[PDB]
């Protein structure tokens, strides 16, 4: 971008990035067409649960950096949504039981791969350090975001549906990129922040590929046991 | 898992046992060491290891920003001096890059650095920024586990290669710190966890490079042939 794009040209630039959305990863494709194994489904739920539990922290980090009462009023709804005040992280826990993991397997974080954790912690850390407009606008990948019964009859229906139901906002993070990125300076940088975010989603699934699709989890050449660290070190 | 506090020497043994997990046991390191790596693999290893290397001094400065002990700073700043020159260990990597057929701009641009590498390496710097200075200083200890190309890869250039091995050539410090500081079972167990963390970073970097250069599945390989990952230290620049 050399000349400042208009609001609506900047929008299509932002959406042209949906071309790299994680639905295009082979791990995501082998899941939604029924070729994924039990280990792969459960491995996805457990790792993707890590992303889900970090997002309210990421959103709270944005609010800590935001002197604007009005924006905080609207942004806190994201935390209310995940934590419940119910709540989206409870939909993830029932999905975990639906695929044969327990609450303490998910809650413990032990199955979470180091490569997923690094990719997810990258998001949190960016949110912590970046100015709030920029962190807030990275949530925008959920524009690109909107079957398992037939595919995997072993998944419990009861829990699987509670995952679907519960998953009952972006009218924001887009109305704000266009409203904050009024130079080629800001636009270029927003497209790069957006790319960052897409890389995080792609890397989570790369980490899952190596471990569950390729039988190359960390240290596979040294042990058959899980040996990675399982702690959020700076928080716990 | 430590139930009863080990002696400092028993506790050194448990730290050193963690070398079983050192990144030399990764198939990507092994393929390089025994001559089965492609030039693409080697060049991408140098390009990506470079990012780790230019981050070390940032990480060391972070420990220092957190260290109110002048005496430790005096020892710790020496690592920055060795990396940055006063050249320059980072220069040794740059000359290694040229010997494998990368330009200095290739390396300094950080264009070729894979997101998986960036995230692992940035994890290390972020821990040093936020952890107390002792825990962060002790995570440097994987260096204890550290200490054939011309024959397997005769297309590697002589001078840059030699210069890299030359400029090659501190650690009696950070183990002393761990033995002195980790004086409870809780500190011990947490320090083995912080060392696992560090080990995981090293391993994750090689996984990222495996996916990209050994398996031909770099990010967005199903969408584009081109590098489309982000290439920026977003918070720093
Ligand atoms: O705050 C955020 O940034 C954020 C981002 C994303 C994302 O990047 O797609 C999701 C969510 N939240 C979320 O709650 C969620 O259920 C979700 C599902 C997906 C997906 O494609 O599977 N992304 C996201
Ligand atoms: O080649 C290797 O296997 C290797 C590993 C490590 C390590 O264990 O972190 C370092 C280095 N090399 C290295 O050259 C270096 O300057 C360095 C600094 C540090 C540190 O943690 O501060 N590790 C390493």
Swiss-Prot record, chain A:
Its EC number is 1.3.3.11. Keywords: Oxidoreductase, PQQ biosynthesis. NCBIfam families: PQQ_syn_pqqC. InterPro entries: Haem_Oase-like_multi-hlx, PqqC, PqqC-like, Thiaminase-2/PQQC. PANTHER family: 4-AMINOBENZOATE SYNTHASE, PQQC-LIKE PROTEIN. The keyword Oxidoreductase applies. It catalyses: 6-(2-amino-2-carboxyethyl)-7,8-dioxo-1,2,3,4,7,8-hexahydroquinoline-2,4-dicarboxylate + 3 O2 = pyrroloquinoline quinone + 2 H2O2 + 2 H2O + H(+). SUPFAM superfamilies: Heme oxygenase-like. The keyword DNA-binding does not apply. This is Pyrroloquinoline-quinone synthase. GO terms for molecular function: pyrroloquinoline-quinone synthase activity. The lineage of its organism: Bacteria, Pseudomonadati, Pseudomonadota, Gammaproteobacteria, Enterobacterales. Pathway: Cofactor biosynthesis; pyrroloquinoline quinone biosynthesis. Belongs to the PqqC family.
């Amino acid at each position: 971008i050399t000349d400042t794009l208009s609001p609506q040209a900047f929008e299509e630039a932002l959406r042209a990035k949906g071309d790299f959305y994680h639905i295009h990863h082979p791990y995501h494709i082998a899941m939604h067409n029924g070729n994924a194994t039990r280990e792969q489904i459960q491995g996805w739920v457990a790792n993707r649960f890590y992303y889900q539990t970090t997002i309210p922290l990421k959103d709270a980090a944005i609010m800590a950096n935001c002197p604007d009462a009005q924006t905080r009023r609207k942004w806190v709804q994201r935390i209310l949504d995940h934590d419940g005040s119910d709540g989206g992280i409870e939909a993830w826990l029932r999905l975990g039981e639906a695929v044969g993991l327990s609450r303490d397997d998910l809650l413990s974080e032990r199955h979470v791969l180091p490569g997923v954790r690094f990719a997810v912690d990258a998001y949190l850390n960016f949110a912590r350090r970046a100015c709030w407009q920029e962190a807030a606008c990275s949530s925008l990948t959920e524009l690109f975001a909107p079957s398992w019964p037939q595919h995997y009859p072993w998944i419990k229906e009861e829990g699987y549906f509670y995952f679907r139901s519960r998953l009952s906002d972006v009218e924001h993070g887009l109305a704000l990129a266009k409203a904050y990125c009024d130079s080629a300076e800001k636009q270029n940088r927003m497209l790069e922040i957006l790319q960052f975010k897409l890389d995080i989603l792609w890397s989570m699934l790369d980490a899952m590929t190596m471990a569950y699709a390729l039988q190359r989890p960390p240290y596979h050449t040294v042990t058959d046991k899980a040996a990675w660290h399982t702690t959020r070190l700076v928080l716990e």
